[PDB]
Enzyme design. Sequence first.
Site: not given
Ligand SMILES: [Fe+3]
Lengths: 392, 392, 515, 140, 132, 137, 168
Positions: D133, D136, D140, D103
């Site tokens: 991104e 993300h 995460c 990401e």
């Molecule tokens: Fe992504």
Amino acid sequence: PQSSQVTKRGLTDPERAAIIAAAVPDHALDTQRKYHYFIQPRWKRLSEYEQLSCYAQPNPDWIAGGLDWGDWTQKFHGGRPSWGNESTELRTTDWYRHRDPARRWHHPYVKDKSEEARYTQRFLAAYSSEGSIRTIDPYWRDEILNKYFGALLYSEYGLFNAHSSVGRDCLSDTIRQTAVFAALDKVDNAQMIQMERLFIAKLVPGFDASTDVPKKIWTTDPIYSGARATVQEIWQGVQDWNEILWAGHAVYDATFGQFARREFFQRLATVYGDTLTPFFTAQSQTYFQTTRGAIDDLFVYCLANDSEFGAHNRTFLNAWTEHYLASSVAALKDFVGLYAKVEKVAGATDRAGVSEALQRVFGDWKIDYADKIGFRVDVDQKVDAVLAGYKN
Amino acid sequence: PQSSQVTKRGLTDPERAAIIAAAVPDHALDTQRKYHYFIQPRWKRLSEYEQLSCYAQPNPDWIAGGLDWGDWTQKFHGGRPSWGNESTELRTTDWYRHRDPARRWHHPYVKDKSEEARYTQRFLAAYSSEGSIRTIDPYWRDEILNKYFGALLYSEYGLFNAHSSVGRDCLSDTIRQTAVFAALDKVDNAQMIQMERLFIAKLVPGFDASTDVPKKIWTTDPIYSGARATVQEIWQGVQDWNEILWAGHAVYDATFGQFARREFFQRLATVYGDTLTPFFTAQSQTYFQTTRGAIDDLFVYCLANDSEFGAHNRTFLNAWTEHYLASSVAALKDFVGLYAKVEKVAGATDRAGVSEALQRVFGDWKIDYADKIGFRVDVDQKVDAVLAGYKN
Amino acid sequence: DALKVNRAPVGVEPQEVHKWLQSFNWDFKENRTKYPTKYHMANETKEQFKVIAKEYARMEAAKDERQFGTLLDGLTRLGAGNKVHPRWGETMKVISNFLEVGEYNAIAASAMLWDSATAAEQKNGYLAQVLDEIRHTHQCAFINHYYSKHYHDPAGHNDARRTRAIGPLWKGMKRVFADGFISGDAVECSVNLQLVGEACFTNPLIVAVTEWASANGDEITPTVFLSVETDELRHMANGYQTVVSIANDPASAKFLNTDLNNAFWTQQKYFTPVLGYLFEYGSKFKVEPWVKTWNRWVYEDWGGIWIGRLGKYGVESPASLRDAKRDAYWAHHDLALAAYAMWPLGFARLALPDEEDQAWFEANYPGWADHYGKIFNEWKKLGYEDPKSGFIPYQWLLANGHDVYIDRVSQVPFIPSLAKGTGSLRVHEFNGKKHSLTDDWGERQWLIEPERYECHNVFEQYEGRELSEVIAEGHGVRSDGKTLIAQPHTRGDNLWTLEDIKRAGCVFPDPLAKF
Amino acid sequence: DALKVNRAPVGVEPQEVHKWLQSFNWDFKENRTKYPTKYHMANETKEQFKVIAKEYARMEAAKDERQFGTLLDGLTRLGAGNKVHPRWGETMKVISNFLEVGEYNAIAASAMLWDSATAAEQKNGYLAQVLDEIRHTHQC
Amino acid sequence: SSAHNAYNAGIMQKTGKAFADEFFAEENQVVHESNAVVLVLMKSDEIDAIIEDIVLKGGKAKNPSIVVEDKAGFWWIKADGAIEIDAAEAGELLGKPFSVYDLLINVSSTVGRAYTLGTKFTITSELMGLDR
Amino acid sequence: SSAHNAYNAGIMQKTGKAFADEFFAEENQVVHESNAVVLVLMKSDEIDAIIEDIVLKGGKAKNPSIVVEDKAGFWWIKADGAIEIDAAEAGELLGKPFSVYDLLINVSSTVGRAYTLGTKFTITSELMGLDRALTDI
Amino acid sequence: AKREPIHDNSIRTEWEAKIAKLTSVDQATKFIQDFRLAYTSPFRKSYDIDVDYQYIERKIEEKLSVLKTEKLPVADLITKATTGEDAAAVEATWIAKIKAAKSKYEAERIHIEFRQLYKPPVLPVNVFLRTDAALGTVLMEIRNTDYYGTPLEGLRKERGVKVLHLQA
Ligand SMILES: [Fe+3]
Ligand SMILES: [Fe+3]
Ligand SMILES: [Fe+3]
């Protein structure tokens, strides 16, 4: 180790989840999954707003629209019912018909105002960091805004409190929600005005954000005498909850309030270089139009056109409009003496400028309210009556 | 019945939940529950902002601050590394030191902009319903606002795109977030300007919200010649990602951008009766101050005062400032020819009023940026250079 | 001036505005409450939770986003809406919708307190409460709305705002946390709604119940109810302030103990049996004996921390408390007889106590097996659950002299020949109308205030009518128009229809005709 | 004029602004990508998902509120965080942190695509991706 | 300190006839003044951190009469005199903005006199306005 | 008419050696053009209503090749040609505001060419920009 | 013996037919006052329409109100009872009456009869509500003086009930 049992969750405990699984049928026991499917939808499909709100009020069949039966379980000493028809002069075939066109139940309502709460503080932190107050006219800042916009918070505050008996007395759920959200918006207006004053005090040495001068002006300055008289009457002089909502929002605030907030303080902020007040009047004006949407549905769509009582209700609404328009005209005639204290700007604060502002306020009101209940009004006569208080 | 297995959830299925319960230890296997506990906190305790952002970039130890080791797994044809020291002239002991003082990771950033998105549409729906557009000066609306505020969206838009190589090239996570959040705010500015023009088109017959005239002005009107020349260089003429961020935000946008948005369009709106534009500039000005907080930390706290490279970095920052201040002064000298087209208001659009506006912008800039990197600037000389373009 | 200004970033915090609210009121002759009250004391109190409109909304919206996130995303992906034991999902039809009317009437009560408050801060505090009770109305609605979408039996979850009007337990609900809140002295609401209702009974009704939900697999109701009660801190604090005003004025203090005693009895009279019945009989897994829940929250903690502490300032332990503790032990078992016997008039599916339940009842309430247990087992043998049986226990009660009466004041059912809780039947004729009263406290209320208590009961409205006709007319059927919402079992098969009810030939009597 | 105006309630929808995005670019000699590429073809494409900055933020915030509600309220109240089989909870140390770097690098990759796009709509679409991104990485 | 503050303290330990005998004893037909407070905290990520690292450490060290019980969806807290939670201390623990108003998002119930003063939330046995 | 769109269609029915034999067959060492689309919907209150009352009713009525499979946390949908979801139909079903942007909040994945057009979301096997339209209307 | 359906029955239908024949404010005012004296409050003359009288009262209210708006000048809607009396005079008269009441039994009958006679639409809503509140205040104060001082046996006699049954 605690004295009491650590309760096992039936969702996750294997033993209890297995017992639950054995007990739950393998098929649904009805197919009707629309919560309160029997509500008559106002729009093309039933809304979540209607599902969560409609028929929460437990009215019996002797209050128009109620689905219950029998007398209340406990009444006032004397026999006044918990809710009853004696609470208002207006009549309808169904008190539940009202719908807020914004479809506000509690959650979308506070969601939207939370956005405004948090963005406001970010705006103020950046505005103070910008130094943009440096270009405001000081006389406007100190002699008009601080004192007379401050005093206007008391109008908003009185209108807020006018809703207290309405919140108790009114006869349906959607009406009660409309009234309470309108009340919070009014007290918000008053708090927001004080917030702007408290904010200016942090940027301008010697600027006093005490409510002492505003309150003296509200309670004793002839500029606010008619307005204060009206607010006192709407809030504390009557208890008919439809009269309160109509006089407060559809007559008084729709004429005097709109003129004071929008034509005086908001509009004149953009001729005297005030880049701060427009952020605050944006909020109050947004609330006004949201409130008007719901007030308009209650009195125009439902009450003024109820199939059995529309003409009956318009008779009362016309009498109230006659009385409270006179009050508001008198309030505005007093208020326009404030133009004698402002720097003359052509087309804004001269006689022609005030005349056009009064023409907007009275002309818009004729379109938005008077025409819809059959109240005849000569806009030029109301403008000319107010201008009699204008010092040339 | 579906072709594939209906997987049993371990959380709720009795058999699988019992197997998991048997396998889960009866005690924690470590007590350190602070995610990335080893990040050095900027404030009194580690913030969630830092925990979620810091060391996400997998830099090796030969990029100052990196905790990894060894060469990249795959480089450019020729050998340019994935990230590398060749990407900027500036040097530091640790590229990870930067901290946004607003502590924006993705979630608080969009949460805040979501509030603004939804409140804006409510404000517009209420503003159109209020009819408040009726009191705007028509010449300001059509000949200045629509054309030249429209044209300004291209400045915001070019500054947005200057960030594209910055997002690829910059050397740490917190810097990358700062840069990307800054870029979205700029393209938001450009979009919000267009949104205001499209909104006025719905209220004013004959008002054209096409970008055709704004774009023609941006590309060929001498008023924007210097500004466009500067944005083109900052966006496409260099690739040093620190130079872009510094010239973009700390020089060009802090002088030309602040003057155009705040001193010209926002301030004069509150001189020509414009009750709509301040709602939109309130956002761009809030974004500017938020971006400045983060830009200030990167260049002043981290780079201009890096324990080993502070003087080294100030040599470049001074040289960049010398160049892009000259560009921005020329941009401003061209822009103030716009005052020749506006109705003269004493203290705002006369020579004295423009001078004080230039003194605010250059004076504020000297305090917010120049003084912090040791850049000598005579504020009155920069004011006089711009006033050379003012038509008396 | 035009060049120099402090450019430090500042905003304005909620308490900075709140400081000035008390000055927002101004003096004028008509500035006084519109509602009748005995309480005229000085009441310029300070708000314990400083809130303004903008901050009110920020707080509640944050609460909501987490709650609806859990409901609409997480628990739906788990299919949690149908992981509930049938008895409990049936119980939440009643708990959520009945509480909803309590929440709804609390809006109106809070407006009365707002209208009767004289301090701007108190008016400000009562507005926040008015808004909260609106939030709680929609939250209670949202629970049944959610169950309607995801639970195996949406009927009755999906229409209680009309189907509640069929049955007798709903009448008592309209008094306990409704008419009792809004129809009387407005300043007194700080005693009945707040000092008693909010500070005492919402804890077991809204907080303690979430543990029973969890034990029975319901994670929806905890998510919402625990959020509901977060607003209660402000409400209790609001009422306490006004109680202090009343305690400090001798002319107002002379009314306080009487109003407190009446409030306590009025609310416990319904709350104690009805919630104990719903907890213990509307559950498979029991958390603890209801009487212990009541002892913990009502008698020991509320009674000691609120009432016992205020006893230092002349507030008396309610004279009705002893009668109440008897209700806490047995009244919910008495109510269960009436609830099961009259099941066709409800909108929930019931389950007779199974063998494990019966042992639990007898261990925790010795004597239950030889009285209530024997009755439920005989009803089961007679075909209580079997739609082909033609058996409905209400008829069986009458055939054995176990008449059911409705209290003219509280609307709570009373079976004097089977009851072990507090009560004795008093039947009076006044002006050609017969009235049945069931305890010393309501009888006094009715004798002194007969025009406050004219509520029609089910027997007066349904007299001489056949049971299936009443049920059909009141829409007590599923979408096929035939199968009853109410059921005497919780299985998916052998559901009762109107024809099954009609076959029993149950016709409503006049219970007072014999006097 | 000063008295007469249409007062019907209107706003401006995202697609109404999006219509004009392609015109936000202007021509100049250096308006070309900074990165080496073999691909020099015409690329004046239109975006399939019309988004502007305000609408981007509204969409993602709505996603977040539901996600974080579930995590911080519901699942925590269930104690779900320790209802995981040890093997899988160990596997998520790797899956989530390794995906995190994917990401994170997708941010930089998407910025490159943004830089090399020549259409304003495509530049706008890649910025939205650039922001995603970041989201993300933080997820995460 | 501190068994008397347990949820199942005293009569609650008894069952069957023994419970009924105390429940209906003459001296238990009037309320008994208690110096305790009850605080209910809705389980959540933030609350659970506050319970473990504030209430059960500094809180219980300051007030050893504190008892915390797990009631499935909420934490049940009982103590002598008063319970206090500083949102500023909680914000340091959580690493995110956390005013006293944010703390109240998961404060589900109070038996006692509750108020906020600055960053601190307090529930107290004290009867303010009556007590001196 | 839709068995080929099942998650476990074809080779996925085979296990052990039988699976290996087809998996490594010479003809399965190159991709095969498929006319299908795959749509993944994250399970939620709104999505589950849309699956039951739109995709599995009107959706399957228009396109009988639709297969919907329960994959615990999401719905897996495969169909020939195209899948479409009208956000206006969903808002009517849900009773609350629901633009095409709100529909996307729980649209988790797409195998195919996905786009929004007005209130309608579409994923299609068509290669827009490459496939040439077959009618002028 | 056997009640008809709740919301649609011959008793309501028959009374609606009576109400439709009202043609003047004076007639409908005597009608609604006679009705409220006959069928409302614990001192009503008859319980024969007990489960229908509240709905029927609503319908009479509706007929009287429409007749008022069709027939009366606007100023009468604000300042007069439909008896012709001055609304302000009605207010002062009944407040003075209940303030001179010597017992809660006197005061209660004054409040109840005021409502029977002047409940809207007979009296203007604003005047009625504030008179009713003032009356209710006096009634509450006298009733809550020594609320528990009279034993139930004494209250039964003061109320004048015929005791039909006392359990145990
Ligand atoms: Fe992504
Ligand atoms: Fe509540
Ligand atoms: Fe409450």
